[PDB]
């Protein structure tokens, strides 16, 4: 309208039926079922706690 109350946009997104993915890869890419990490000696022969 030529005369109008002011505004301030609100943004959002809806992602239905979607599992968020955080792959255990060093570059986040999917270059094989057995990922890059999970084969490194850092995570293979040692024991680590996840928080």
């Amino acid at each position: 309208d030529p005369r109008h109350a002011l505004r301030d946009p609100e943004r959002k997104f809806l992602c239905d039926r979607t599992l968020w993915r955080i792959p255990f890869s060093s570059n986040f890419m999917s270059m094989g079922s057995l990922t890059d990490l999970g084969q490194n000696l850092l995570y293979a022969n040692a024991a680590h706690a996840l928080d």
Binding site: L41, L42, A46, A47, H48, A49, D51
Partner: protein, 51 residues
């Protein structure tokens, strides 16, 4: 010296370890930590002060 002295392989100098569990009677405050010494690095316990 310019070789075989430092790693330059993206490793940290200081590490903050939070206890895996803590129990506190009103006389003593017991904290349990598990510190993981890398895969190749070594440390002397002259460091590792309790904060």
């Amino acid at each position: 010296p310019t070789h075989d002295v430092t790693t330059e392989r993206s490793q940290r100098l200081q590490l903050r370890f939070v206890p895996v569990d803590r129990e506190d009677t009103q006389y003593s405050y017991k904290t349990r930590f598990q510190l993981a010494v890398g895969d190749n690095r070594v440390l002397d316990m002259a460091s590792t002060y309790f904060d």
